[PDB]
Design a protein around this ligand. Sequence first.
Ligand SMILES: Oc1cc(Cl)c(Cl)cc1O
Ligand SMILES: Oc1cc(Cl)c(Cl)cc1O
Ligand SMILES: [Fe+3]
Ligand SMILES: [Fe+3]
Lengths: 256, 256
Amino acid sequence: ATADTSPERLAAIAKDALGALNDVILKHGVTYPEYRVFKQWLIDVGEGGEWPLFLDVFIEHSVEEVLARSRKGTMGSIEGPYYIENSPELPSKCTLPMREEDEKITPLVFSGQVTDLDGNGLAGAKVELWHADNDGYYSQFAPHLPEWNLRGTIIADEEGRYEITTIQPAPYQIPTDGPTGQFIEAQNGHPWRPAHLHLIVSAPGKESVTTQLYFKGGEWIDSDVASATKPELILDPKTGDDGKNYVTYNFVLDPA
Amino acid sequence: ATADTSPERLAAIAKDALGALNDVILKHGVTYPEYRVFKQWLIDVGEGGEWPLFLDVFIEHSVEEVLARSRKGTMGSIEGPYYIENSPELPSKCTLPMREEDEKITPLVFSGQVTDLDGNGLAGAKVELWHADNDGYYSQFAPHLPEWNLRGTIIADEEGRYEITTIQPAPYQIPTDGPTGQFIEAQNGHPWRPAHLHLIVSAPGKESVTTQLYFKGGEWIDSDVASATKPELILDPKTGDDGKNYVTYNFVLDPA
Ligand SMILES: Oc1cc(Cl)c(Cl)cc1O
Ligand SMILES: Oc1cc(Cl)c(Cl)cc1O
Ligand SMILES: [Fe+3]
Ligand SMILES: [Fe+3]
């Protein structure tokens, strides 16, 4: 990864970031035993491979918030740590790859349209969808799962429409025993994110959008540990007589 | 390491530390490519074993500053990452262990007295001294060095006096190729600390003091990368006719 940040921009960011942290130590009278625990815990974060988790939980929301200012289309949200590029392509009307341990979960039928700022529908539009199973696991991050379980890139039709059947994911829990979970536990927090779909939506000559969608009534929408929920992103699915849940959600893309 | 910090104290520290960092992202409009570089660099810090270095350079000074408020005796300074417990004991009048590559350096004769707040001299007082050689290396952190090179615990006499001959350390440079050095290089900084002695001074029923001493005229006293220099800690050694440099410095210990 590379960034085009100047020495002077970096200096300025570093000065107030370190200044700020040093200010917090002063305000709170952080002790030497505390400093020692902090040092060991930073070591533990790295040793446990949790920098992607910790940052995406506690920092990414502010980086999306910056990006949001430059965008007129659908609300973005954090990518989080579980995205995988090049998920297998599926047609506009499709069902995500899934196991038999998944086919017993009430189906979720997700429909809608990808458009521009003026509402023109968009051909060649792709919807990359990934989410957790009813167990709260992601494929490629749980060795029991078929590697593209609940992952796909949907090819939207000429009008920019799709109909994807999947399942509702379970809420996600941050493993309690790792450094991040221990950080949360030690301050009496909840290591939970509400149930959510991840989507990256793209189209020719359009700026892609990374977002998440949530479920009205879901537990933890009011207390997402990653501060990544937005009211605009909450789905209210209706139940059909097949007993499946139906929801329509449209994507609006900024020009590239 | 353990600390006795409450869930509520931890919550409060975390809230403003993360809040502060998220505020810096917002103020500066930190980008996704920047966020990605930041994430990789945190990973690299851990992989390179540089959490002790980075924190002691950029954070420890604030933790000593907190501790300083509760102390009436000699000014403290940061421990930094190179302290080693149980260095071999030496008598009140002694010379630090050193090589032949060290005996060619002009000697530094360091004298003084350990006392209490009222100026009463202190028996059973110990002066743990450690510093770098003329090359800027520390023993146990450079495989060529005898493991206690320029390290000792000095036993002060009945009056609390010592006379330790050593050498003046060279200034210290933070390795430029590691994540911390690369952090410094990318913002156009200087990876240098002024030449310094480290001391931990202790006595029966007294609160030990961790401090450093610096050298008038030394380069980088005006720009210590670790912000750990204080005017009270700067030595002005006088040259004798043996051509050795002489300095007197007294330690004043708070009661335990
Ligand atoms: O997408 C995610 C993002 C974060 Cl931060 C967490 Cl904790 C879990 C996720 O499933
Ligand atoms: O004692 C030290 C403390 C720090 Cl922070 C550095 Cl960079 C070098 C040292 O020799
Ligand atoms: Fe997720
Ligand atoms: Fe040092």
